[PDB]
Design a protein around this ligand. Sequence first.
Ligand SMILES: Nc1ncnc2c1ncn2[C@@H]1O[C@H](COP(=O)(O)OP(=O)(O)O)[C@@H](O)[C@H]1O
Ligand SMILES: Nc1ncnc2c1ncn2[C@@H]1O[C@H](COP(=O)(O)OP(=O)(O)O)[C@@H](O)[C@H]1O
Ligand SMILES: OC[C@H]1O[C@H](O)[C@H](O)[C@@H](O)[C@H]1O
Ligand SMILES: OC[C@H]1O[C@H](O)[C@H](O)[C@@H](O)[C@H]1O
Ligand SMILES: [Mg+2]
Ligand SMILES: [Mg+2]
Ligand code: NA
Ligand code: NA
Lengths: 391, 391
Amino acid sequence: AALRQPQVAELLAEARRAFREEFGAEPELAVSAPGRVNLIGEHTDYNQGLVLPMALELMTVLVGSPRKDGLVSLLTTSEGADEPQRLQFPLPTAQRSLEPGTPRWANYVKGVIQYYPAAPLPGFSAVVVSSVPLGGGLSSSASLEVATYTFLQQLCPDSGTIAARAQVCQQAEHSFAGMPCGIMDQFISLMGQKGHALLIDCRSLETSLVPLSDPKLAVLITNSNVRHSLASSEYPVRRRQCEEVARALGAASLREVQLEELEAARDLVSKEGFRRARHVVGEIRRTAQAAAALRRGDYRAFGRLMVESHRSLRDDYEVSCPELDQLVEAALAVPGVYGSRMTGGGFGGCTVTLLEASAAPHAMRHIQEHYGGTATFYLSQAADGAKVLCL
Amino acid sequence: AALRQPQVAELLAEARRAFREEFGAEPELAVSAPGRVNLIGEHTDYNQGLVLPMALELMTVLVGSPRKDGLVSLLTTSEGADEPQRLQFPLPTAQRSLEPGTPRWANYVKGVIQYYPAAPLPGFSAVVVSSVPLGGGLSSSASLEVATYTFLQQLCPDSGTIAARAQVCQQAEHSFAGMPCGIMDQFISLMGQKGHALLIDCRSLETSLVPLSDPKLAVLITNSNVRHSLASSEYPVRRRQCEEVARALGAASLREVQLEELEAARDLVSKEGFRRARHVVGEIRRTAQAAAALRRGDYRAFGRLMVESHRSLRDDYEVSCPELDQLVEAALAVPGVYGSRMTGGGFGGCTVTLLEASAAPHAMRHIQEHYGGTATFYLSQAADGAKVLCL
Ligand SMILES: Nc1ncnc2c1ncn2[C@@H]1O[C@H](COP(=O)(O)OP(=O)(O)O)[C@@H](O)[C@H]1O
Ligand SMILES: Nc1ncnc2c1ncn2[C@@H]1O[C@H](COP(=O)(O)OP(=O)(O)O)[C@@H](O)[C@H]1O
Ligand SMILES: OC[C@H]1O[C@H](O)[C@H](O)[C@@H](O)[C@H]1O
Ligand SMILES: OC[C@H]1O[C@H](O)[C@H](O)[C@@H](O)[C@H]1O
Ligand SMILES: [Mg+2]
Ligand SMILES: [Mg+2]
Ligand code: NA
Ligand code: NA
């Protein structure tokens, strides 16, 4: 059975209750920002590549009020954050910028405040609630960042585009969480549309909505509930390796490189560098092709490209893990599935399976049996992106 | 001088004031929906073609409150609107539906109510204010429809998609306003992102957000301050003319006819229908070429394609008028101007001019000095789509 995904009104109700308790009054302001699953296009965003994510009904809700004292007071209800669940700190000033510290979870919020481009920002009181599993590879980090950004807009309206907001949150993750992420997770949290995946061009920042308007078609997310300790360990190593292959080929990014230049420049780069870069040029072509397939309603072919994505991620990019491999195989055994693959950064988190809606019950029953650990499941539809909730 | 474009704060404050005077208390809810300019792709939307509009900073703001008495009570502050500017009527029920009546401006709101897809809808009191000029060709009609729709979502949440909202608003315009528009104006008012043009495929309802972030580039809008009612007359004539050329060629729409295939099929259709179809099929091709020029920052190429769109609308489609053609040829004589063309329906309304930012002041002097009438100007950036405003 799939996990019940609580609606915005339920999270917003728990957020109001926890806030009213903590601060002594009803909060004035509220926002939501969703998590995400990448259908295909993994380890391409920081290579100026193509990705095809959708926003989930799994989301972070922030409620709060402005203060007059220039302090920030936070409570997260998520049990997976490092303690304390409470933190206060002063707004950054001309005299003193914020610095990352403990607890680590608040570094995400500190970073978005630090880089928020509009002034004057007042202090505020806020509670965070989330149905996005922390560390699940469904972007709880981006969801928290974009909820924070969208809350700050309610206190002090910004002047810029949705791309700039995504880049503020990305910068927060780089400087304050030490995670050199690409733009995808922030961009989909902001830009998601109900009943659509987004083809995102991480070079141009052009976005194409592709309809997911088909009740025969189900996206199943399977959480391995494994988080191996290569996560924010081997991810920065892959990004730097890609960037060295590009510079040693004289390209601004691997987006500017094709498999034929790469094969011809094999002696200019490490054996490992070649393999990383082979995944990325392949993956960019696969996600352009997969987008076109999805538009024409050719699920068979989209599934094929998904399974080629998994193989490439597992062997050439080495960011899968026995648990994710086992889920992907178990899912491909089930009559009615088009494809299955790891989604997110890897070394744990979730798989994304595309299949016939009528197969979902069997798919779940099968996968859980044929999995060593304990999988949770989500039947997900493409959700809206970040919005204001008027209290 | 460009005409001042009021900010959302100034429009909220006017709407609340008018709402306090009329209904005796502060409104509970607020929304906004923008007008639009079409950069290229005219009279293609209802031919299942391509369009490239952007949302304007000109907008409609609805503020209101739910009622318990199943009544709708409305006031517009637009002095352009036909008398009376205030109106009360019951919601439709099982037995009885709303019908188009008088005043005509209220039919846009009656229409969105009648075809609003979710229940139950309470009665409501609302004030509308607008900075979109009524009848000026920047789609005050779609702006009013989308702001009404977005307001109805606050009373009674809907569960369909962004495209289904555009269709409800299009249907209201067809049945209640008697104007068989395509989907462009409703779609951009819903889907507009600040700093972006929207490439809409009106066959697949696929959309691409294309960035417009060269601040040396500007979009000048010149209102002719003319409108002939050769327009409400000839729009539906052009539409059926297009439908009978497709039928006569065995195609579902002119989107299925390539330009060279149409040139070789001259003998299948009237020499009038032929020229109508040549505009359309060629405008669809020009829009894909214009999108591609935008993506590589070729404003010269974009500009020349706008001028071909204009010459085509003037000669082949015959929906320009002397005022629009004087405005265009005056703009093209200004150094720094890339292109100029009539935008929207025709027979009046505005031109759109792509020029160097630093040339705009000279262009406004030249165009006015060389125009037989009284031009008004707007220097508009790509703006946001419809949204909720929290009071
Ligand atoms: N709602 C939340 N409350 C507290 N901390 C959160 C919340 N959402 C995310 N986090 C923080 O972000 C971290 C997860 O980010 P990351 O390791 O990139 O995984 P993912 O984004 O894939 O879930 C958590 O360990 C925690 O620090
Ligand atoms: N804010 C408004 N208040 C009242 N009526 C409005 C408003 N905005 C639009 N309308 C209605 O829409 C009509 C104009 O639409 P139309 O003739 O299609 O021109 P356009 O959409 O190009 O401005 C007005 O005459 C009026 O009936
Ligand atoms: O595709 C891999 C994926 O991994 C993590 O989710 C990062 O946050 C994204 O930017 C992206 O790099
Ligand atoms: O492109 C011409 C244009 O004309 C009018 O604005 C209609 O409202 C739109 O649907 C479109 O057909
Ligand atoms: Mg993350
Ligand atoms: Mg109109
Ligand atoms: Na199991
Ligand atoms: Na004049």
